[PDB]
Structure formats: C-alpha cells, structure tokens
Amino acid sequence: LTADVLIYDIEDAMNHYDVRSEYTSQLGESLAMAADGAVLAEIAGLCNVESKYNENIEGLGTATVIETTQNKAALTDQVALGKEIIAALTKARAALTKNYVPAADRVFYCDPDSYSAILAALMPNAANYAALIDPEKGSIRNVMGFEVVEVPHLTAGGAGTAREGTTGQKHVFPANKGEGNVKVAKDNVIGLFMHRSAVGTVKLRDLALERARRANFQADQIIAKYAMGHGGLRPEAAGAVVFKVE
Amino acid sequence: LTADVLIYDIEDAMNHYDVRSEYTSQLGESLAMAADGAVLAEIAGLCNVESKYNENIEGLGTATVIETTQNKAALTDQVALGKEIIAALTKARAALTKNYVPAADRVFYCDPDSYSAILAALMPNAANYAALIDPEKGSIRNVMGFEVVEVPHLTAGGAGTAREGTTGQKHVFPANKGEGNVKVAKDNVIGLFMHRSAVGTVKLRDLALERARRANFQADQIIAKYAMGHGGLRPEAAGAVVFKVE
Amino acid sequence: LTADVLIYDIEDAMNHYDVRSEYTSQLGESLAMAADGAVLAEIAGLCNVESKYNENIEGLGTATVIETTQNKAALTDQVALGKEIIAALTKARAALTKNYVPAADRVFYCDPDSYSAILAALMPNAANYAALIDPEKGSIRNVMGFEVVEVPHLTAGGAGTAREGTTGQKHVFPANKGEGNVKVAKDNVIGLFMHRSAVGTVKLRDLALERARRANFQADQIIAKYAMGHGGLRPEAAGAVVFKVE
Amino acid sequence: LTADVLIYDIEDAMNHYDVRSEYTSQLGESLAMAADGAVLAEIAGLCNVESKYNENIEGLGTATVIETTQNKAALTDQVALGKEIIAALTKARAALTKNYVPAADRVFYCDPDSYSAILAALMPNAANYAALIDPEKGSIRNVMGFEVVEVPHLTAGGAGTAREGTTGQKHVFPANKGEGNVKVAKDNVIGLFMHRSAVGTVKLRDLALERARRANFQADQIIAKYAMGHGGLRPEAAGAVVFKVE
Amino acid sequence: LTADVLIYDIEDAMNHYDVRSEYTSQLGESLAMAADGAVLAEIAGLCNVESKYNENIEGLGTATVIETTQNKAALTDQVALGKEIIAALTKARAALTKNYVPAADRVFYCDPDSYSAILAALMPNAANYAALIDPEKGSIRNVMGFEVVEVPHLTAGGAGTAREGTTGQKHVFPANKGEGNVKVAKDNVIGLFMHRSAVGTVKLRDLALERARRANFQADQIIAKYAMGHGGLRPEAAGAVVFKVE
Amino acid sequence: LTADVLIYDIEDAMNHYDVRSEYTSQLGESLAMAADGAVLAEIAGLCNVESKYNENIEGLGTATVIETTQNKAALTDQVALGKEIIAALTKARAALTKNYVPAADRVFYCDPDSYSAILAALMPNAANYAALIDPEKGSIRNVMGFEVVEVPHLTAGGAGTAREGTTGQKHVFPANKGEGNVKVAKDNVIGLFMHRSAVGTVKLRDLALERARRANFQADQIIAKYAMGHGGLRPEAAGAVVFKVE
Amino acid sequence: LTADVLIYDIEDAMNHYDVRSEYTSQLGESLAMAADGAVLAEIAGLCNVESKYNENIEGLGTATVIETTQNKAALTDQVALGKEIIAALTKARAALTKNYVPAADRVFYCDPDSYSAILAALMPNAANYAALIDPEKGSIRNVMGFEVVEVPHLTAGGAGTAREGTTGQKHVFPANKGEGNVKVAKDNVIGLFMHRSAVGTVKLRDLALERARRANFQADQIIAKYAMGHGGLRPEAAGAVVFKVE
C-alpha cells in the first residue's frame, strides 16, 4: 500500500484537464540547433515533449475507521489522510515506473533498466554492480543519479553478501528511507525488486499527473456505516499514474 | 512484574465501557482494493478493523506496605502506585504481545515473529539477524521499526558474541530501557526473550484497552491490616490486556 | 548535451570584445631564475601568453517548454536555464579540450594527452596506467593533478577490471561528479573517452571565451509557438569555445 | 421469528455495555442455613455467577411496511415493534438454549437435557417421561420446574398418544402459550422440539444480554423506500443471545 | 569492613523503638486467591509477617584521623563518614544474610541457599549452575532475581573456568559493583562466598534494623587524643543487623 | 618527566612540618570492636594510621627558558609552571607507587601487585588478565577500582593482541589520559609498565606529602643567565614523594 | 604549492632579526634532572633550547595575473595573497618537517618517524598501525597526538584497505582538511606521504621562522608587464623554513 516518495520527485509532473487525467514528461526534443555566424537556418527540428492520455476511475482502495477511534483520537484521521496520500502517490511512482496503473497493465517483476526488460539471473547472491553501470549509462546526455528501487529483502541480501559493499548495499542504510544507492540515494519498496538498476530518466518510463492527491472520499452514508459511526474513507487515486513505456 | 513501556505506545489503544474491558486495533482490515473503474464490486472489504473481548478478575498481584513506612515516607505510596501501574501496563504489553491475560492463556516462549511461532534453534550463540529481516518484512505494506523485546541475558549475550554488532546488541545499550534494536529502539524485559524478532504491526497480535490503569485498591480494612496500619494495596489490572492472534 | 563543469575551472578564461568572440590563455613560458649568492645570471623570462580569435555564432541548442508547464511550474524555466548553461559550458570545456567548436572541427576520439594524439590499443581491458604517468610528466615546470575526462562506460570498465585499483577507477567513485582520478579528481563525460590521460596544461589545448554564459534567447514569437504558448528557449553558446592545438 | 417469552424470564439476565453486548449467568450456586436459641451460625455459600462474550452484527431480519398502512393504521407500527422485540427476545431464549446466536453456531436438534446432547429415539410415539425425571434430577441441589420447550407438533402428538397424560401433554393446553409441563408450565415453540426434557438451570446453557431489546431501526432513507414511503424497519438484535455450553 | 550495598536494598527494613534495636520483614505468606468466572472460594490469606528483637551495642570498630589530616583535608572526614556507614551497612547486609551480628553468631561459610546450608563440593572448578536453578526455584510464589553474593576469588575463578559463561561469571563483570549474576545483578564481597546461590527472599534470612546508620561518634576526648588532635571517630553500627534464620 | 595525575588522587596525602617533609596514609587500624550485650570492654586494640619521615633536597630537574620567548609569550611561563608541577606530582605518584624518591631507591620494573613483586613472564603477548583478579583481590576488606599504570607500548600491545578485549586494552582508549582499565579508569605512563596489575590500597605502597607543589624557583641570577635574560626556572620537588613499602 | 596549515600550529615559531632569517624551538634542552640533594651537581645541562641560522633568497614561486582580471574582480588579488601565504606557510611546515628549504636540501620520501628515517615496505597494502605506536612512543616524556601527514592517495588507499579502520583511514575523512589520525587530527598533503607516522615533538625536526609571511612582492614594473597591465606577484618566502634534524 504505502511506500517511499522518491521516484515521484525526480520524475516529471503535470496537469492537463478534461474528463480523463492528463500529464506531460520531458521526453524527446531533437531541436535543430540550426547553425549561425553568417547565416541562420530555420529551427527545422521542432518542439517535442510528450503529453499522454489515461481514463479509468481513480485507483480505489478503501480505508475504514470507527467513530469511537475517530472521536477519541482526532489525529488518526489526518494521519490516515497523510498515509493514504503517500500510498497512492507511491502506487503512483510504482505505476509510473512499473506496477499497477488504474487501467489494467501486465503484472511485472523488477525495476526498469533503461526501461522494463526481461528478468535475468545475477552472478552474485544479491542483485549487484549492474547498479553502478546503469545511471552511469545515464551519464551520457543524460543526467545521472537515479533512485534504484530495491526490495528490503535484497537490501538485507546486499547487507549480507557481495555487493558494491559486502556489508550494507551500495550504502549501509535501513529500508524504506531516503538512503544511498549508486551515485545518489536508494529507494526501498515492495513490488519493485532490484535486478539491473534504474536510470529513471524521467520521461520514457515515468510521468506523474494529478488534479490533486489520491482522492480521500469519506462516506459516513452507507447502510451499515451511519449507525456504527464507522467511516468509509476511500482512497480513490485522484489525478493518476501511468507508464508510457514499461 | 514491572517492565518497560514501549510496546504499549506503538500499540493501538481504545476504550469502550462494559463491566468488562474492551479494545479496537487497526486489525487486518480487508481493504479490498477494488480498482473498480466501471463498474464496481461491493468492496469485498467488510469493515474488519477489530474490536475485541476480555473479561476476568482484573490481573491480581497485591503489594502490602506498613503504616510506619507510609507515614515515614509520603512518597512511597505514589511511587508504588507509579510502579505497579507500569507493572500491569507492561504485563499489558506482555499479555498484549504474548504473556499472561486475565483469562488463562498458554504459557509461551519467545516474542511473536509476524505473530507467535514455534521456538527454533539459532545459528549464532545469541539470537540474531532474523532481527533485521523482520521489521524489514514490515518494510512491505507496513511501517518498519518495531521494538524487539529481549531478555537482559540475550542482550548481554548479544553484547558478548556474534550479533548485528559483535559488541552490544544491534545497538550497544543497557538493559530495561528505551534503547536500540534493528531500525529502531529495542525493548528489554524478562519473560519475553528474543528469537526471530518482532514486527508488531500492531493489530493482529497486540491491542491495548483500558477504562483506566491497573486498579490500585488499597484496603486498610482487613482483619490483620487495620490494627497494624499495614496497607493492602492490591494491583487488579483495570481495563486489561490481550492478544487476538498469539 | 550536459556534462560536468571541471575542465572549465582549471582552464584559463577571458573576454576580449569585438564582432567575434575572444579569449586569452597563459601559453608556454620561460620562468628563468638563475643561480644566486653573488651574483645572479640573466633571466630571459619572455612569457609566450596567447590571445586568439573565433568568428561563428554561439553554439546553438534550442529548448522547448509549453506554456502550461511554464505556468504550473515556475521553477522549470530557471532549472532549464540552469541546465543549458552548464550544457554549453561543458560543450565549452569539451570544445575547449576536444569536441564541437562553433566553427566546424574534426570529429575526434579520446581526450588529449599533452594534446590530441592518435588512438592506440590499451593492454588492460579498460584504459589504464598511462593515467598516472601523464600528470607525472606534468611534474616538470608543470603543475600536476589534471581532471582526466573519461566516459562512464570505461569508468565501470575500470570498476570491473585492472586499473590503478582493480575495483573502482583510480578512485572508487560515481560518474558525472567531482570524483577522483590520478593525483586529483576525475571527470566523467560522454564524447571524451579516456585512453592516455590528460595533462590539461592549460593553455595549449584549452581556453575559455565568454561575454556571458550560453545565451538563452526565449522567443514566444514563432508562427506556431504564440498560440500554444509553447516556448522557444534557444541556447546559443554566448561567448565561445575553442581549441588552439587539438 | 416470534415465539413465547418463558425461558428468558427463568434465565439470568444482565447489562454490561461496551461495544459488543454482555451478560452474567449464575453458574449454579451453593447456599446454607443457620439455627437459633443461642448461638447464631454463618452460612457457607458461593453464589456461582459467570459472564462471557459475543461480538457480531446484531441479529438481522428486516420487516418492510408501506406508508399507506402506516398512515391508515397508527397501531401497526407499535404492534410490529411489540412483535419483533419478542421475536429476537425469543430468538434470544432460543439462541440462549440452542438456536441462532449472532455468531454462527452449529444448527442443532432438540432442547438441551442438562445441556445439549445427541438426539435419540424415544419409546412412545411422542417424546415422553424423560420429562418428569429431568427436573427431578433438578430436585437435588437445583430448584425444580423448568419450562420444557416443545413443538406444537409433538404437543398435538402428545395430545394424541402416550404421555404423562394420554390426552394432552403433561397438561392439556394450547400451543404457544404459558401452559403446563412437568411440575411447572410448558413452552411451545417451533425449532426447539422436545426429546429428553429441560432442567434449564440457568447458567451453563442460558444467559441473556441486553443494552436494550432487539434494536428497531426504521429507515425511510433507502433509494426505493423514500418515494413509496415504504418503511425499512429492520430488527437488528441489540444486546445479544448466547449459550456458554450448548 | 566495607562491601557493596545491594543486599540491603532488596531486603526489608524497619524501625521499632525501645532500649534495644528492632525490625520487621514480610515472612512467608498465603495469598489465597481462588477461582472465578463465578465465585470466590475462601481467601484464608493469613499474612505471616515478623518483627524481632536484638540487644547489643551497635557493631563497633573505631576509625582514626589526626588533626593535621583533618585540617589539611576537610573532605577526609565526610569521606570516612561516607565509607564507614557503608562498611557497617554492609556488615549489616552481611549480618543480615550470614556474617557477624552485634550478638555473637556462629562463624559461617557460604551465602544462604534458601537459607544457610552445609558447604558441599562443586563439580566445576568454580562455584556453578546451582546459581540458575536457585532463583528459578524462586519462580513459584517466590520472586526471582536475587543478588548472589560471591567472593572476588571465585569471580575470577568464574572468569577463568566453566560457569554459565566460561569467560566472566554469569555475566562478565568487575567485582564489588552492581554487576550481573543469574537473572539479575551480582554481588561481590568477602566472607560471603558463592556455593549454591542465594534466593534472598527477603525475610527468613534477611531483615534490616535502623534508628540511623552506623553511629559515628568522634571523641577528641581521650587521654592521648586531645594533645595530638588525633580523632577517635568510632563506628558503632546504630540500629542493628540480624538473621532470624541463618 | 610529565605523566598523568591519577594515582595521586586515589592515594592519601598529608602535611606534617619540620626541617624534612612529612606524610600520613590510612595504613592499618586494628579497632577493637569490643562488643556489648550489657556490657562493654576497653578498646584494647588501638588507633593506628601511619606517619613517616623523609629528608632529601626536593627532587630537582631544571627548566631553562629565554627572555625573548618569556617576553614574546607571557603564557609560556605559566604553562611551564603548569607542566612541571604535574611532572614532579607524577614523579610523585611514581615514587609514591614505585619509581624515583628524592632519596635514592632501587631502580624497579613494573607497577606494584599488592606491593612491588618480582617480574615474571606473561602467557599472552601483552600483559593480561592478572589485571581483573588484582583489584578484585582488593574486593575483600579492600575497596576495588585501582588505576593500573601501564606503558603506552603495552597499551598498543593490548590494543593489538589478547587482553580482556583483543582490540583495545581492558577498555579501548588513547594513552596518557583518564581512560579505562579493570573495574575503573586506566593510567598510562612511562617507567611503570603493567605486569600483574595494581591494587593501590592506598597506604602500604603509597603516601603523598606536600608543603606545596614541586618548588618552581626561577633564578635570573646566574653568571650566564642574567645577560642573556635566559631564565633558570628550576623544579625542586617541594613537599616529597615516598613508598613505605615497595 | 598550497597545503593544509596544521604542522605549523603544533610547531614552535620565533623571530630573531639580522640579515638572515631566524627561529627558536624548545629543542633537546639538556634539562639535567640533577636530583642534586646536596652537594651541588651543577646542572650538567647547558641551555640547549635552540636558536638557529639560515640565509638564502626567499622561497620563490611567481604567480602572474592580468590587469583585466585584477579590475574585473578585486577579490582575486586578496584571495591569491590569501592562498600563496598558505602555500609557502605549508612549504614552511613541509620544509619544517622534510621538503624544500630555501637552502638546497636532499629530496626526501615520507614524513619523519621521530625524525626522518629510511623508507621501508609496510605489511598491509596502505601504510598502517605504525601510526598508533608513534605518537604513543611520544606518550612517554612527550605530549602525544601529532598530525600525521599523508597523501590523498594513501588516504583513499587507507579508505579502501586494511588500516586502523578498514573503511576510512584512522578516521573516515576527506583529503586536505583538519581531519582525524591516530589519537588526534590527520594532515593530508602531496609530497609528504605516510609510512611510519609522525611524533612531531616539536622541536627536533621542526621550527618556524618569520619576520612575516611569504613576501608578496607584486611588480607592475617589468618590460612586458607594464603595457599589458599583467601583474608580477612573486611569492618570495619571507621569514623562512628549516629542519635542524631531518
């Protein structure tokens, strides 16, 4: 449900508005640099950048809290609101990188390399050095330093067996936190396990769109919810979350 | 009798009010993630955030203090009151994780893993690395960092032999205090020894309840207590303390 | 497009002003000193500092941002401005060491040794020890410690096979960063790959021009750009960027 | 649905109130006596009185009535309210002896002997003399005379064939009324047929809970109920109804 | 003379006042509780507590300090006062457990088991595992975790040869300090050597008297003391120190 | 010359005054505890404590500074004064434990055991566990925790090879500081190397006399010192420094 | 050229004035520890606190800066002045430990042990533990904790392989900064690499001369410097820098 917000920040975000949810990531931009001195040429390249389209009812996943706990603790609502936002904002990042889009996508394995590739066997016991070479492959045009999204299990596997550092991962850190990977900070979440690492740059794979955060619609008006006072705080992922390329 | 208050704070706490004692935890709520779109299913998620039962004579454990000491030191009563509260509030966390409920439960060994499992032999001399992997298993869905409850013996044994750190436990700390374990602070109490560590999340095993603290009923009205002035301060655990899943 | 600003700093920079772009580097020099006591000998200290000439307009490289992204995110303009500057200030260092001058130069391979030489085969799998001996050749009169500009691919090649250190390069470091090479910090960029290392002195190969940074001319006045609101933020490398000796 | 209220009255009832419903039954009891002239003696007595547990959605069984009949007859609401109360207060007595507890219990045959036993074949055509000997087993310790619950079928069967009296049951009486069985009054309900009779003391089998009667909520607020005026009076058994031992 | 104050704290202390010194300890008691659900059987919890009698002058043994030391160092008096208090308060614990009462007691060997028993040969080189089982015998009604009082020589003997841990004692610790034994902290003093460990509960063996601490009576009024200025600061163990059962 | 001040503090200090320097340490004190019942006896023991005698001219060892440095830095005098005080106050401790008394003593090896014994071979490479048992032997009548004086060399030997802890000494600490040995803080000085550790009680071995600190007599009145301005700040150990027993 | 100022601070500094540059360190002062007593042992220790002599052209190393940059940035002069001061104040520390004295000295390898010794092969890959033992050899007579000067290469080599700590040096720190070595802070400069560590006491090897800092003489009066405006800022090391013992 809830993970770390790290792939959202580096990744591009936008807000087009229609009946669906809409987004722009800094994709291609060839941009004919023409020429000069004497004399100029027409900007015969073109304005690029991508804008895409997605229509499905906001990724739902209700949360339910009783009136007694709602009254005893006033904070538990705002904390729930503050937890479920992140949950679908990470069900964003994962579903912006590779996981569950509101529209049904293929259930996938590891985090995208340059973009999602087939899962292969790794020579060391934990997933390894393919990390270093990846956002290093993104050392071309390309800006480096990308949050490799690893499962905590392979992080402990990293902390145990051969890695960039045999003890700890690339950097010795606890799971699910702003930590340290190859050339930047690591990301630890479930669903996305590390294989060949991520260079989430930041377009082809990822692109965040939101009218607002995941919509927290709390309905006290249900056939059973009204009398108990039990709440129906339903996370419906307002805005959205999509990959253009796996 | 008295232990450390650490599993109570992270644990869910509530107050309904019968003649008994009652509690609500954020239990395995079937938050049926009905992605819906169009059209829905009636969320296969019936409100499962539990409220549960316990009823017995409030956890007894009398402490008898003389009138002469009661008059010589005025503080000895409030300190006793301030010690026995914690005692059954830690007999709470204990009988909230795995120990002695007012109602007779099975006498159990180590602290619950994800929940209580059969005791197994550990490779190193002290109980080990299963520590890190546990609240790291609580790095999925879950928030991580759970107070692993360990005996001062295995803590000092950890401070002696192979652990996360060969000297000290996971963190070098004295026993029976807010210290340091895997990814958070450790707990050190007698009765609950460490094996495979705890991911007290937070509902399934643990859930605190109380009308009030353990009921301190001091009776000066006993056949032998009145003439001596000797007090009959009897800790009867008001509210109470329970597990739903061992 | 964008690389690291490391060669620019160690490289000499100036600003003459005419219709063209201009620059001065401290070329070869006789720091004649002679022997003392009584009496001294002649100091034929004739400095051979240079000033050169280049007439071509500002290495262009337009960038494009839609009005919607410009309005939603105010930062994306200043970040673009702050990215494209570096891009052509590194297209500078590059076309100041060996890359693409505003005036058409020969497309070249590796980074200059003492200056650009023919590409030869290297005995170890990655590009090697010729590193250490290069700024060691830069120890006579010469100041030592020059940022050897290596491609990321050979950096991981270094981090894999025989180098100064078999694991890591000369120093175990991330790409595209102020890292570590032979007797100083390394530079990692694409286009300039390591062969026989650089003794960037400092002058002969390198010399920075600038009236200002790469000129960012944003035109909202294009036949298609005005109605969309899409921006024509055109990088044109103001000042310039040239080698005297390849 | 609706039966006779007789087992409820002879049964122990209590009101604790938390979130789930609660109850205390006198688990038997011991009593003593004293003598005079001189020299008064003390009574050695232990008034056995247990208390237990039931959490579930209040025993449902909606009854829908139209606005036209609600307006035509004002009494039809209070009569319905006065009928459904008894219904779940007899679904009480039933699920207090052996029937349908809010929590799913095993579907059972006849009324408890001393407590629910296996159904056996009876020698006479109708269920017989085991009646007299049962509250005669309640002649020792226990008080005697317990409302044996029988179906109108075996009552009319008793009225036809060999019983305590060949014509009529133990006493000649109509079905579903405060009548006459062995040593006391009989009970006649459907669901609980007579086999070996009942010594409903009072505890082990039976114990009545109630914050209030079965909660009568009438909803004029349903998608189809508002326009028609049709009422949604739903019997949800507030308090509860249980067996400690079948 | 001086030892550790650890047995005094766990042991009961009181103050009756007459010509002699006096004390009260909570002797072995019945905490009759009985069963519930129902219904409490007889609580014949007749508390057996004790108060005893001892007559002799306060365990003496002077302490000499010259006027020149008293004048030069002002602290050496308060330090002496602060050392001799402990000395006879540990001659207390000692003559409260097993040592030298103001009234002549039998010169004894080891620390009391459940109470003083005959000294036997121990299988391992140092005194051993009888340790763990002693406060484990103290796990019925009996409280656990008692400061096992051991001689330093057997503590290093423990630190050398087979114990609970072959290196160190039960816990690897310095002598004469709040250290670590079986299921609690150890006590290290002379006179009381370890054999079969102590379950110092907390009455039968031990009970502390005191009107005040060991009475420090400094007399500058002796035929030889006045002229030299030499002080006759005499420890006389005010209150007292006794065993009821060896 | 200069060492650490740690043995001086734990050791008894005094000041008798005549032509010589004089001192009293808390040696023996028999102390006839006598008794009572009724029924006292004369204190037939006797007040003891030791006072001793030493006559030699204050341990000399000049410190000669120049006027130019004395005028340039005013602090260099007070710092010298503040260094040489410690020097002969550590030449005290070492000459209070075993080193150089103003009166010619035998040149000795290691620090006193219970008092200076013959140097023997130690089983581990560095000087070892005899440490733990020593001030532990001083856990009897004796108070524990004595600053074991060790050479920095054997401290590194401790930090390198088998000790109480294989890395670090008894405690991992830098040399010549208030550190950590067996049961207290360690002392590191040259001249006194560790063999079998010290139980500096406190008297028999040690006793500090001082009229004042080591006398800092600065003479600007020497045949060569007056014209140069060069100072003759000569440390003459005012007060003294002696062992009663080696 | 420029290094860190750390050896200068711990080193003695002075200022005699003649035609040459001059200096006084607290050198091997024969502080004849003539214990004296009687019968004057006229201190066989002549005042040996040294004052030495050195005459040569102030350490040259010109830095030429153009008028255009001098006018464009006013700070570049004061920064240069503030950089070259340190340069020859570290060429000081260097030619105060072992480097380049104004008078021609032998070109040497590593930093002095107790003073410069022959370079030997070290067992571990980087230069090692001889670190800890060295200022620990200066834990005798001497004050300890001396800035061991090491190259960034062996620092990063130390950060890679076996040292006091396998990761990092003695302390994990960046190169060319006030960091951490054995017992104190480390120094990292090029030219002085680490072998067996430094006990810079403080005197024997080191001693700083200065009338002032390295003399910054900027001449705008050269045959080619006047018309261009190019400055002739020549670092001629005023004061001086010498070893008395290598």
From Swiss-Prot, chains A, B, C, D, E, F, G:
Source organism, top-level taxon: Viruses
One GO-annotated biological process of the protein: viral translational frameshifting
Keyword Thylakoid: no
GO cellular component terms given for this protein: viral capsid
Spans annotated as Intercapsomeric interactions: 53-57
A single GO molecular function term of this UniProt record: identical protein binding
Annotated compartments: Virion
Protein keywords: Capsid protein, Virion
Chief location category: virion
Keyword Zinc-finger: no
Signal peptide limits: none
Assembly information from the UniProt record: Homohexamer. Interacts with the connector protein and the minor capsid protein. Interacts with the capsid assembly scaffolding protein; capsid proteins and scaffolding proteins form building blocks that assemble to form the procapsid, each hexamer of the major capsid protein interacting with 2 scaffolding proteins.
Domain notes: The N-terminus interacts with an internal region of the major capsid protein subunit in an adjacent capsomere (intercapsomeric interactions) to stabilize the capsid.
Functional description taken from the UniProt entry: Assembles with the minor capsid protein to form an icosahedral capsid with a T=7 symmetry, about 60 nm in diameter, and consisting of 415 capsid proteins. The major and minor capsid proteins are incorporated into the capsid in about a 90/10 ratio respectively. Once the capsid is formed, encapsidates one single copy of the viral genome.
Family according to the record: Belongs to the T7virus major capsid protein family.
Full protein name: Major capsid protein
